[PDB]
Amino acid sequence: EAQTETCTVAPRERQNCGFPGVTPSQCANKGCCFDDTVRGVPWCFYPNTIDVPPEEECEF
Amino acid sequence: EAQTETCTVAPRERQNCGFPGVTPSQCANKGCCFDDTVRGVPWCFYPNTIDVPPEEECEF
């Protein structure tokens, strides 16, 4: 298996993982992927990214 | 300290790892790449080792 889905799941279908005000640090506290790019929906949710490569890259 | 195996290699230089008649499951069954897009050359071939030496950041 290679690169697959991601933590960017359907905002409406995103399985909440905490509170709406959750943050990158707050969420991680539980262990989920953050995404406050959409209001009304929870920022802390469960992701779905599958791959065999490393678990760290770069995005600057 | 961060190497990775790719498949985007040159056929003429690609390291055969399984005849073309091979299937995606067969080729991968050994742990090699499978590209049935290029004819004439070996469809199933070993991956490639590549690194990413820094110099100022990580977007290089």
CSV table of N, CA, C and O in Angstrom, one decimal:
chain,number,residue,atom,x,y,z
A,1,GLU,N,0.8,-1.2,0.0
A,1,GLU,CA,0.0,0.0,0.0
A,1,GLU,C,0.9,1.3,0.0
A,1,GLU,O,1.9,1.3,0.6
A,2,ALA,N,0.4,2.3,-0.7
A,2,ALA,CA,1.1,3.6,-0.7
A,2,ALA,C,0.3,4.7,-0.1
A,2,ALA,O,-0.2,4.5,1.1
A,3,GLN,N,0.2,5.8,-0.7
A,3,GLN,CA,-0.5,7.0,-0.2
A,3,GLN,C,-2.0,6.8,-0.4
A,3,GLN,O,-2.5,6.4,-1.4
A,4,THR,N,-2.8,7.1,0.7
A,4,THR,CA,-4.2,6.9,0.6
A,4,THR,C,-4.9,8.1,1.3
A,4,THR,O,-4.4,9.2,1.3
A,5,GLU,N,-6.2,7.9,1.7
A,5,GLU,CA,-7.0,9.0,2.3
A,5,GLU,C,-6.2,9.8,3.3
A,5,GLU,O,-5.0,9.6,3.5
A,6,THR,N,-6.9,10.7,4.0
A,6,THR,CA,-6.2,11.7,4.8
A,6,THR,C,-7.1,12.1,6.0
A,6,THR,O,-8.2,11.6,6.1
A,7,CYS,N,-6.7,13.1,6.8
A,7,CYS,CA,-7.4,13.6,7.9
A,7,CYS,C,-8.5,14.6,7.4
A,7,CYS,O,-9.3,15.1,8.1
A,8,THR,N,-8.4,14.9,6.1
A,8,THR,CA,-9.3,15.8,5.4
A,8,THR,C,-10.6,15.1,5.0
A,8,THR,O,-10.8,15.0,3.8
A,9,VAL,N,-11.4,14.7,5.9
A,9,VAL,CA,-12.6,14.0,5.6
A,9,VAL,C,-13.8,14.9,5.5
A,9,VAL,O,-13.7,16.1,5.9
A,10,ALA,N,-14.9,14.4,4.9
A,10,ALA,CA,-16.1,15.3,4.7
A,10,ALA,C,-16.4,16.0,6.0
A,10,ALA,O,-16.8,15.4,7.0
A,11,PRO,N,-16.3,17.4,6.0
A,11,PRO,CA,-16.6,18.2,7.1
A,11,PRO,C,-17.9,17.8,7.8
A,11,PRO,O,-17.9,17.7,9.1
A,12,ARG,N,-18.9,17.6,7.1
A,12,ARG,CA,-20.2,17.2,7.7
A,12,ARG,C,-20.2,15.8,8.1
A,12,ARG,O,-20.9,15.4,9.1
A,13,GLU,N,-19.4,14.9,7.5
A,13,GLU,CA,-19.3,13.5,7.8
A,13,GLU,C,-18.1,13.3,8.8
A,13,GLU,O,-17.9,12.2,9.3
A,14,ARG,N,-17.4,14.3,9.1
A,14,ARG,CA,-16.3,14.2,10.0
A,14,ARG,C,-16.7,13.8,11.4
A,14,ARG,O,-17.6,14.4,12.0
A,15,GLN,N,-16.1,12.7,11.9
A,15,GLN,CA,-16.5,12.2,13.2
A,15,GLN,C,-15.9,13.0,14.3
A,15,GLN,O,-14.7,12.8,14.7
A,16,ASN,N,-16.6,13.9,14.9
A,16,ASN,CA,-16.1,14.8,16.0
A,16,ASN,C,-15.1,14.0,16.9
A,16,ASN,O,-15.3,12.8,17.1
A,17,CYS,N,-14.2,14.7,17.5
A,17,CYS,CA,-13.2,14.1,18.4
A,17,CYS,C,-13.0,15.0,19.6
A,17,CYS,O,-12.2,14.7,20.5
A,18,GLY,N,-13.8,16.0,19.7
A,18,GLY,CA,-13.8,16.9,20.9
A,18,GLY,C,-14.8,18.1,20.8
A,18,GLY,O,-15.9,17.8,20.5
A,19,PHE,N,-14.3,19.3,21.1
A,19,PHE,CA,-15.1,20.4,21.0
A,19,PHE,C,-14.8,21.3,19.8
A,19,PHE,O,-13.8,21.1,19.1
A,20,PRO,N,-15.8,22.2,19.4
A,20,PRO,CA,-15.6,23.1,18.2
A,20,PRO,C,-14.4,24.0,18.4
A,20,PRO,O,-13.8,24.4,17.4
A,21,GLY,N,-14.1,24.4,19.6
A,21,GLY,CA,-13.0,25.3,19.8
A,21,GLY,C,-11.7,24.6,19.9
A,21,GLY,O,-10.7,25.3,20.1
A,22,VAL,N,-11.7,23.3,19.8
A,22,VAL,CA,-10.5,22.5,19.9
A,22,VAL,C,-9.4,23.1,19.0
A,22,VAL,O,-9.7,23.7,17.9
A,23,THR,N,-8.2,22.9,19.4
A,23,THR,CA,-7.0,23.4,18.6
A,23,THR,C,-6.1,22.3,18.3
A,23,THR,O,-6.3,21.2,18.7
A,24,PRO,N,-5.0,22.6,17.5
A,24,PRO,CA,-4.0,21.6,17.1
A,24,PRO,C,-3.4,20.9,18.4
A,24,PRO,O,-3.2,19.7,18.4
A,25,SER,N,-3.1,21.7,19.4
A,25,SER,CA,-2.5,21.1,20.6
A,25,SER,C,-3.6,20.5,21.5
A,25,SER,O,-3.4,19.4,22.0
A,26,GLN,N,-4.7,21.1,21.6
A,26,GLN,CA,-5.8,20.6,22.4
A,26,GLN,C,-6.3,19.3,21.9
A,26,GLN,O,-6.4,18.3,22.6
A,27,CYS,N,-6.5,19.2,20.6
A,27,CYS,CA,-7.0,18.0,19.9
A,27,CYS,C,-6.0,16.9,20.1
A,27,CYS,O,-6.3,15.8,20.6
A,28,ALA,N,-4.7,17.1,19.6
A,28,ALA,CA,-3.7,16.2,19.8
A,28,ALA,C,-3.7,15.5,21.2
A,28,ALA,O,-3.4,14.3,21.3
A,29,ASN,N,-4.1,16.3,22.2
A,29,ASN,CA,-4.2,15.8,23.5
A,29,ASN,C,-5.0,14.5,23.6
A,29,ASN,O,-4.8,13.6,24.3
A,30,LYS,N,-6.1,14.5,22.7
A,30,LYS,CA,-6.9,13.3,22.6
A,30,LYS,C,-6.3,12.3,21.5
A,30,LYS,O,-6.3,11.1,21.8
A,31,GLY,N,-5.8,12.9,20.4
A,31,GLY,CA,-5.2,12.1,19.4
A,31,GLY,C,-6.0,12.0,18.1
A,31,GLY,O,-6.4,11.0,17.7
A,32,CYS,N,-6.2,13.2,17.6
A,32,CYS,CA,-7.0,13.3,16.3
A,32,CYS,C,-6.4,14.4,15.4
A,32,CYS,O,-5.5,15.1,15.8
A,33,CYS,N,-6.9,14.5,14.2
A,33,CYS,CA,-6.4,15.4,13.2
A,33,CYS,C,-7.2,16.7,13.3
A,33,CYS,O,-8.5,16.7,13.3
A,34,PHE,N,-6.5,17.9,13.3
A,34,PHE,CA,-7.2,19.2,13.4
A,34,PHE,C,-7.5,19.7,12.0
A,34,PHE,O,-6.9,19.4,11.0
A,35,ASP,N,-8.5,20.6,12.0
A,35,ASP,CA,-9.0,21.2,10.8
A,35,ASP,C,-10.0,22.3,11.0
A,35,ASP,O,-11.2,22.1,10.9
A,36,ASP,N,-9.5,23.5,11.5
A,36,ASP,CA,-10.4,24.6,11.8
A,36,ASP,C,-10.6,25.5,10.5
A,36,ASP,O,-10.8,26.7,10.7
A,37,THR,N,-10.6,24.8,9.4
A,37,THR,CA,-10.8,25.6,8.1
A,37,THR,C,-12.3,25.7,7.8
A,37,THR,O,-12.6,26.4,6.8
A,38,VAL,N,-13.1,25.1,8.6
A,38,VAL,CA,-14.6,25.2,8.4
A,38,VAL,C,-15.3,25.4,9.8
A,38,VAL,O,-15.1,24.7,10.7
A,39,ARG,N,-16.1,26.4,9.8
A,39,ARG,CA,-16.9,26.7,11.0
A,39,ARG,C,-18.1,25.8,11.1
A,39,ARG,O,-18.3,24.9,10.3
A,40,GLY,N,-18.9,26.0,12.1
A,40,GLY,CA,-20.1,25.1,12.3
A,40,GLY,C,-19.8,23.7,12.7
A,40,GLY,O,-20.5,23.0,13.4
A,41,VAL,N,-18.7,23.2,12.1
A,41,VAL,CA,-18.2,21.8,12.3
A,41,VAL,C,-17.1,21.8,13.3
A,41,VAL,O,-16.4,22.8,13.5
A,42,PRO,N,-16.9,20.6,13.9
A,42,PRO,CA,-15.8,20.5,14.9
A,42,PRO,C,-14.4,20.5,14.2
A,42,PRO,O,-14.2,19.9,13.2
A,43,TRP,N,-13.4,21.2,14.9
A,43,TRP,CA,-12.1,21.2,14.3
A,43,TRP,C,-11.3,20.0,14.6
A,43,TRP,O,-10.4,19.5,13.9
A,44,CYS,N,-11.6,19.4,15.8
A,44,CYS,CA,-10.9,18.1,16.2
A,44,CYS,C,-11.8,16.9,15.8
A,44,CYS,O,-12.9,16.8,16.3
A,45,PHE,N,-11.3,16.1,14.9
A,45,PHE,CA,-12.0,15.0,14.4
A,45,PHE,C,-11.1,13.8,14.1
A,45,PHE,O,-9.9,14.0,14.1
A,46,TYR,N,-11.7,12.7,13.8
A,46,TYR,CA,-10.9,11.5,13.4
A,46,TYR,C,-10.6,11.5,11.9
A,46,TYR,O,-11.4,11.8,11.1
A,47,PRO,N,-9.3,11.3,11.6
A,47,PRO,CA,-8.8,11.3,10.2
A,47,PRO,C,-8.9,10.0,9.5
A,47,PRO,O,-9.2,9.0,10.1
A,48,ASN,N,-8.5,10.0,8.2
A,48,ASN,CA,-8.3,8.7,7.5
A,48,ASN,C,-7.2,8.8,6.4
A,48,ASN,O,-7.6,8.9,5.2
A,49,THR,N,-6.0,8.7,6.8
A,49,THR,CA,-4.9,8.8,5.9
A,49,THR,C,-4.0,7.5,6.1
A,49,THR,O,-3.6,7.2,7.2
A,50,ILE,N,-3.8,6.8,5.0
A,50,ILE,CA,-3.2,5.5,5.0
A,50,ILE,C,-2.0,5.5,4.0
A,50,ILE,O,-2.1,5.8,2.8
A,51,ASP,N,-0.8,5.0,4.5
A,51,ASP,CA,0.4,5.0,3.7
A,51,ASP,C,1.5,4.2,4.4
A,51,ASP,O,1.3,3.8,5.5
A,52,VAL,N,2.5,3.8,3.6
A,52,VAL,CA,3.6,3.0,4.1
A,52,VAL,C,4.9,3.9,4.3
A,52,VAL,O,5.8,3.4,5.0
A,53,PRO,N,4.9,5.1,3.8
A,53,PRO,CA,6.0,6.0,3.9
A,53,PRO,C,6.2,6.5,5.4
A,53,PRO,O,5.5,6.0,6.3
A,54,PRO,N,7.0,7.5,5.6
A,54,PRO,CA,7.3,8.1,6.9
A,54,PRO,C,6.1,8.9,7.4
A,54,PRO,O,5.1,9.1,6.7
A,55,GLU,N,6.2,9.3,8.7
A,55,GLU,CA,5.1,10.0,9.3
A,55,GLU,C,5.5,11.4,9.7
A,55,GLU,O,5.1,12.0,10.7
A,56,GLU,N,6.3,12.0,8.8
A,56,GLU,CA,6.7,13.4,8.9
A,56,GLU,C,7.4,14.0,7.7
A,56,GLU,O,8.3,13.3,7.1
A,57,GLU,N,6.9,15.1,7.2
A,57,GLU,CA,7.4,15.7,6.0
A,57,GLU,C,7.7,17.2,6.2
A,57,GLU,O,8.4,17.6,7.2
A,58,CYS,N,7.1,18.1,5.4
A,58,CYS,CA,7.2,19.5,5.5
A,58,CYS,C,6.2,20.2,4.7
A,58,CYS,O,5.9,19.8,3.6
A,59,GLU,N,5.7,21.3,5.2
A,59,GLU,CA,4.7,22.1,4.4
A,59,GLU,C,4.9,23.6,4.8
A,59,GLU,O,4.0,24.2,5.5
A,60,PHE,N,5.9,24.2,4.3
A,60,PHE,CA,6.2,25.7,4.5
A,60,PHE,C,5.9,26.5,3.3
A,60,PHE,O,4.8,26.9,3.1
B,1,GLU,N,19.4,10.4,6.5
B,1,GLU,CA,18.7,9.7,7.7
B,1,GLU,C,17.2,9.6,7.3
B,1,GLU,O,16.4,9.1,8.1
B,2,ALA,N,16.9,10.0,6.1
B,2,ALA,CA,15.5,9.9,5.6
B,2,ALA,C,15.4,9.5,4.1
B,2,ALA,O,15.2,10.3,3.3
B,3,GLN,N,15.6,8.2,3.9
B,3,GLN,CA,15.6,7.7,2.5
B,3,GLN,C,14.2,7.2,2.2
B,3,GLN,O,13.4,6.8,3.1
B,4,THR,N,13.9,7.1,0.9
B,4,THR,CA,12.6,6.6,0.4
B,4,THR,C,12.7,5.9,-0.9
B,4,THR,O,13.6,6.2,-1.7
B,5,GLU,N,11.8,4.9,-1.2
B,5,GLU,CA,11.9,4.1,-2.4
B,5,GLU,C,10.8,4.6,-3.4
B,5,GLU,O,9.6,4.7,-3.0
B,6,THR,N,11.2,5.0,-4.6
B,6,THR,CA,10.2,5.5,-5.6
B,6,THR,C,10.1,4.5,-6.8
B,6,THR,O,10.9,3.5,-6.8
B,7,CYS,N,9.3,4.8,-7.7
B,7,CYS,CA,9.1,4.0,-8.9
B,7,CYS,C,9.3,4.8,-10.2
B,7,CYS,O,9.5,4.2,-11.3
B,8,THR,N,9.3,6.1,-10.1
B,8,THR,CA,9.5,7.0,-11.2
B,8,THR,C,10.9,6.9,-11.7
B,8,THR,O,11.7,7.9,-11.6
B,9,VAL,N,11.3,5.8,-12.3
B,9,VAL,CA,12.7,5.6,-12.8
B,9,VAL,C,12.7,5.4,-14.3
B,9,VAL,O,11.6,5.3,-14.9
B,10,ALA,N,13.9,5.4,-14.9
B,10,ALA,CA,14.0,5.2,-16.3
B,10,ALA,C,14.1,3.7,-16.7
B,10,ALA,O,14.9,3.0,-16.2
B,11,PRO,N,13.1,3.3,-17.5
B,11,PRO,CA,13.1,1.8,-17.9
B,11,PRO,C,14.4,1.3,-18.3
B,11,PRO,O,14.9,0.3,-17.7
B,12,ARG,N,15.1,1.9,-19.3
B,12,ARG,CA,16.4,1.5,-19.8
B,12,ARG,C,17.3,1.2,-18.6
B,12,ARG,O,18.2,0.4,-18.7
B,13,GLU,N,17.1,2.0,-17.5
B,13,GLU,CA,17.9,1.9,-16.3
B,13,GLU,C,17.2,1.1,-15.2
B,13,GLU,O,17.8,0.6,-14.3
B,14,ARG,N,15.9,1.0,-15.3
B,14,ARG,CA,15.1,0.3,-14.3
B,14,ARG,C,15.6,-1.1,-14.1
B,14,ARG,O,16.0,-1.8,-15.0
B,15,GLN,N,15.6,-1.5,-12.8
B,15,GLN,CA,16.2,-2.8,-12.5
B,15,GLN,C,15.0,-3.9,-12.5
B,15,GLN,O,14.3,-4.0,-11.5
B,16,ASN,N,14.9,-4.6,-13.6
B,16,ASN,CA,13.9,-5.6,-13.7
B,16,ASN,C,13.7,-6.4,-12.4
B,16,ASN,O,14.6,-6.7,-11.7
B,17,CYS,N,12.4,-6.7,-12.1
B,17,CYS,CA,12.1,-7.5,-11.0
B,17,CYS,C,10.9,-8.4,-11.2
B,17,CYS,O,10.4,-9.1,-10.3
B,18,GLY,N,10.5,-8.4,-12.5
B,18,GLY,CA,9.4,-9.3,-12.9
B,18,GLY,C,8.9,-9.0,-14.3
B,18,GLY,O,8.5,-7.8,-14.6
B,19,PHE,N,8.8,-10.0,-15.1
B,19,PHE,CA,8.4,-9.8,-16.5
B,19,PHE,C,7.1,-9.0,-16.5
B,19,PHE,O,6.4,-8.8,-15.5
B,20,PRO,N,6.8,-8.5,-17.7
B,20,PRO,CA,5.6,-7.7,-17.9
B,20,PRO,C,4.3,-8.4,-17.7
B,20,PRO,O,3.4,-8.0,-17.0
B,21,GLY,N,4.2,-9.7,-18.2
B,21,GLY,CA,3.1,-10.5,-18.1
B,21,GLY,C,2.6,-10.6,-16.6
B,21,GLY,O,1.5,-11.1,-16.3
B,22,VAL,N,3.5,-10.2,-15.7
B,22,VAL,CA,3.2,-10.3,-14.3
B,22,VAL,C,2.0,-9.4,-13.9
B,22,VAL,O,1.8,-8.4,-14.6
B,23,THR,N,1.4,-9.7,-12.8
B,23,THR,CA,0.2,-8.9,-12.4
B,23,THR,C,0.6,-8.0,-11.2
B,23,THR,O,1.6,-8.3,-10.5
B,24,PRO,N,-0.2,-7.0,-10.9
B,24,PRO,CA,0.1,-6.1,-9.8
B,24,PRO,C,0.3,-6.8,-8.5
B,24,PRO,O,1.1,-6.3,-7.7
B,25,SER,N,-0.4,-7.9,-8.3
B,25,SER,CA,-0.3,-8.6,-7.0
B,25,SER,C,1.0,-9.5,-7.0
B,25,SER,O,1.6,-9.6,-6.0
B,26,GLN,N,1.3,-10.0,-8.2
B,26,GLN,CA,2.5,-10.8,-8.3
B,26,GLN,C,3.8,-10.0,-8.1
B,26,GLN,O,4.6,-10.3,-7.3
B,27,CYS,N,3.9,-8.9,-8.9
B,27,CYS,CA,5.1,-8.0,-8.8
B,27,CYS,C,5.2,-7.5,-7.4
B,27,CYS,O,6.3,-7.6,-6.8
B,28,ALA,N,4.1,-6.9,-6.8
B,28,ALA,CA,4.1,-6.4,-5.5
B,28,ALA,C,4.4,-7.5,-4.5
B,28,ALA,O,4.8,-7.2,-3.3
B,29,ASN,N,4.1,-8.7,-4.9
B,29,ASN,CA,4.2,-9.9,-4.0
B,29,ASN,C,5.7,-10.0,-3.6
B,29,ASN,O,6.0,-10.7,-2.6
B,30,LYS,N,6.6,-9.4,-4.4
B,30,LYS,CA,8.0,-9.5,-4.1
B,30,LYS,C,8.5,-8.2,-3.4
B,30,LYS,O,9.5,-8.2,-2.7
B,31,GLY,N,7.8,-7.1,-3.7
B,31,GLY,CA,8.2,-5.8,-3.1
B,31,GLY,C,8.8,-4.9,-4.1
B,31,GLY,O,9.7,-4.1,-3.8
B,32,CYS,N,8.4,-5.0,-5.4
B,32,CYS,CA,8.9,-4.1,-6.4
B,32,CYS,C,7.8,-3.2,-7.0
B,32,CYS,O,6.7,-3.4,-6.7
B,33,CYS,N,8.2,-2.4,-8.0
B,33,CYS,CA,7.3,-1.5,-8.6
B,33,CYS,C,6.7,-2.2,-9.8
B,33,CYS,O,7.3,-3.1,-10.4
B,34,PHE,N,5.5,-1.7,-10.2
B,34,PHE,CA,4.8,-2.3,-11.4
B,34,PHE,C,4.2,-1.2,-12.3
B,34,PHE,O,3.3,-0.6,-11.9
B,35,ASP,N,4.8,-1.0,-13.4
B,35,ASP,CA,4.4,0.0,-14.4
B,35,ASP,C,4.1,-0.6,-15.7
B,35,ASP,O,5.0,-0.9,-16.5
B,36,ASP,N,2.8,-0.8,-16.1
B,36,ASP,CA,2.4,-1.4,-17.3
B,36,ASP,C,2.1,-0.3,-18.3
B,36,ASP,O,1.3,-0.5,-19.3
B,37,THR,N,2.6,0.9,-18.1
B,37,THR,CA,2.4,2.0,-19.0
B,37,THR,C,3.4,2.1,-20.1
B,37,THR,O,3.1,2.5,-21.2
B,38,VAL,N,4.6,1.6,-19.9
B,38,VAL,CA,5.7,1.6,-20.8
B,38,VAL,C,5.9,0.3,-21.4
B,38,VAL,O,6.1,-0.7,-20.7
B,39,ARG,N,5.7,0.2,-22.8
B,39,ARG,CA,5.9,-1.1,-23.5
B,39,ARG,C,7.3,-1.3,-23.9
B,39,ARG,O,8.0,-0.3,-24.1
B,40,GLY,N,7.7,-2.5,-24.1
B,40,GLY,CA,9.1,-2.8,-24.5
B,40,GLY,C,10.0,-3.0,-23.4
B,40,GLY,O,10.9,-3.9,-23.4
B,41,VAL,N,9.9,-2.2,-22.3
B,41,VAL,CA,10.7,-2.3,-21.1
B,41,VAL,C,10.0,-3.2,-20.1
B,41,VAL,O,8.9,-3.5,-20.2
B,42,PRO,N,10.8,-3.6,-19.0
B,42,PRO,CA,10.3,-4.4,-17.9
B,42,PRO,C,9.2,-3.6,-17.1
B,42,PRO,O,9.5,-2.6,-16.5
B,43,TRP,N,8.0,-4.2,-17.0
B,43,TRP,CA,6.9,-3.6,-16.3
B,43,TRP,C,7.2,-3.6,-14.8
B,43,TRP,O,7.0,-2.6,-14.1
B,44,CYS,N,7.6,-4.8,-14.3
B,44,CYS,CA,8.0,-5.0,-12.9
B,44,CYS,C,9.5,-4.8,-12.7
B,44,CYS,O,10.3,-5.5,-13.2
B,45,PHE,N,9.8,-3.8,-11.9
B,45,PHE,CA,11.2,-3.5,-11.6
B,45,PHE,C,11.4,-3.0,-10.1
B,45,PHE,O,10.4,-2.5,-9.5
B,46,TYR,N,12.6,-3.1,-9.6
B,46,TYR,CA,12.9,-2.7,-8.2
B,46,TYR,C,12.7,-1.2,-8.1
B,46,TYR,O,12.8,-0.4,-9.1
B,47,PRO,N,12.5,-0.7,-6.9
B,47,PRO,CA,12.3,0.8,-6.6
B,47,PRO,C,13.6,1.5,-6.8
B,47,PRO,O,14.6,1.1,-7.4
B,48,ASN,N,13.6,2.7,-6.2
B,48,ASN,CA,14.8,3.6,-6.3
B,48,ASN,C,15.1,4.3,-4.9
B,48,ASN,O,14.1,4.8,-4.3
B,49,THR,N,16.3,4.3,-4.5
B,49,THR,CA,16.7,5.0,-3.3
B,49,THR,C,17.1,6.5,-3.5
B,49,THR,O,18.0,6.8,-4.3
B,50,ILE,N,16.3,7.4,-2.8
B,50,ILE,CA,16.6,8.8,-3.0
B,50,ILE,C,16.5,9.5,-1.6
B,50,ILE,O,15.8,9.1,-0.7
B,51,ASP,N,17.3,10.6,-1.5
B,51,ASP,CA,17.4,11.3,-0.2
B,51,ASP,C,17.1,12.8,-0.5
B,51,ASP,O,16.8,13.2,-1.6
B,52,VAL,N,17.0,13.6,0.6
B,52,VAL,CA,16.8,15.0,0.5
B,52,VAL,C,17.7,15.8,1.4
B,52,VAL,O,17.3,16.1,2.5
B,53,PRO,N,18.9,16.1,0.9
B,53,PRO,CA,19.9,16.9,1.7
B,53,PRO,C,19.4,18.4,1.9
B,53,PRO,O,19.2,19.1,0.9
B,54,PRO,N,19.3,18.8,3.1
B,54,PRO,CA,19.0,20.2,3.4
B,54,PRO,C,20.0,21.2,3.0
B,54,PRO,O,21.1,20.8,2.5
B,55,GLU,N,19.8,22.5,3.3
B,55,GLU,CA,20.7,23.5,2.9
B,55,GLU,C,20.3,24.9,3.5
B,55,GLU,O,21.1,25.8,3.7
B,56,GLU,N,19.0,25.0,3.8
B,56,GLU,CA,18.4,26.2,4.4
B,56,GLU,C,17.0,26.0,5.0
B,56,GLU,O,16.6,26.6,5.9
B,57,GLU,N,16.3,25.0,4.4
B,57,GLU,CA,15.0,24.6,4.9
B,57,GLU,C,14.7,23.2,4.7
B,57,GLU,O,15.5,22.3,4.9
B,58,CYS,N,13.4,22.9,4.3
B,58,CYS,CA,13.0,21.5,4.0
B,58,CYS,C,12.2,21.4,2.7
B,58,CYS,O,11.7,20.4,2.3
B,59,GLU,N,12.0,22.6,2.1
B,59,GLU,CA,11.2,22.7,0.9
B,59,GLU,C,12.1,22.6,-0.4
B,59,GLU,O,11.8,23.1,-1.4
B,60,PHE,N,13.2,21.9,-0.2
B,60,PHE,CA,14.2,21.7,-1.3
B,60,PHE,C,14.0,20.3,-1.9
B,60,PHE,O,14.7,19.4,-1.5
